[PDB]
């Protein structure tokens, strides 16, 4: 049963080892979109804050 | 006879004892592993083809047990100890004592699984009620026919390496040689016989 074991836990580390792969790729991509977002949201509100003032003054 | 026997016991024992020692799931196995574990695991593979480890695993140590106990029996009696040593097989007391615990233990189990009113007279009907009278000597048949299958092939032998040796040694060492060469190939091949015909039995006594 433990060297069917190793055998099956090389399959189970084989395939989590690229679920993690892919998975570090994906959080890093999602962190940089969420970034990108944060950035855009802060550009557009600096763009409307500006308008905003120029029509004040 | 009790002392072919018991060497080959000590043998095996011995053997168990080296497995005991080496055993390594996570490292590299040693042969006494791989002899054991590929035996372990045919007749695992075969009970698991009939019944499934998981209603008659008991089987499994017995059957094992049966094949070093006999293979070990066989090939020890082509060791050259001709001039104290014979097969234990020749003698019907060894094979009667083997088949005979193989039968009752089946059956047993087939009783403490269906009961002891109810086993026997589903094994009687059997496959078929129309062969009902026929299963008995189907039942009384399957004892008997692995012990004196057992016997009748080594003391086959028994006799032969002492007819043999009615010839002059120089003629004498080209007919042994042959039936012994062969005959190491004929006792583990029946050695692979009762033990999976105790399995199948046991496997047909259950269903």
């Not at chain 1, 049963?1 to 836990?9: I, P, S």
């Not at chain 1, 993690?20 to 409307?48: C, F, G, I, P």
Request: charge should be positive.
């Amino acid at each position: 049963a433990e060297r069917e074991a190793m055998l099956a836990k090389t399959a189970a580390d084989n395939r989590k080892s690229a679920e993690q792969v892919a998975a570090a790729q994906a959080d890093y991509e999602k962190e940089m979109a969420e970034a990108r977002a944060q950035a855009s949201a802060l550009r557009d509100e600096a763009r409307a804050a500006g308008r905003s003032v120029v029509d004040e003054k | 006879t009790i002392l072919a026997t018991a060497v080959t016991a000590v043998i095996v024992i011995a053997l168990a004892f080296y497995l005991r020692a080496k055993v390594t799931s996570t490292g590299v196995p040693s042969g006494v592993q791989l002899f054991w574990e590929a035996l372990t695991i045919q007749m695992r593979q075969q009970i698991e083809g009939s019944i499934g480890m998981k209603i008659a695993p008991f089987v499994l140590p017995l059957s094992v047990t049966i094949f070093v106990f006999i293979l070990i029996s066989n090939w020890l009696a082509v060791l050259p100890l001709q001039y104290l040593y014979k097969a234990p097989a020749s003698d019907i007391n060894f094979v009667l004592a083997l088949a005979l615990f193989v039968f009752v233990c089946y059956h047993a189990a087939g009783i403490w699984r269906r009961g002891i009113v109810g086993h026997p007279i589903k094994v009687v009907k059997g496959h078929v009620a129309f062969l009902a009278p026929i299963n008995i000597v189907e039942e009384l048949a399957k004892p008997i026919s692995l012990a004196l299958r057992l016997f009748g092939n080594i003391f086959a032998g028994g006799i032969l390496v002492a007819l043999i040796a009615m010839f002059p040694w120089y003629i004498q060492w080209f007919p042994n040689a042959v039936w012994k060469t062969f005959d190491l190939f004929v006792g583990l091949i029946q050695a692979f016989i009762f033990s999976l015909l105790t399995i199948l039995y046991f496997s047909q006594s259950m269903e």
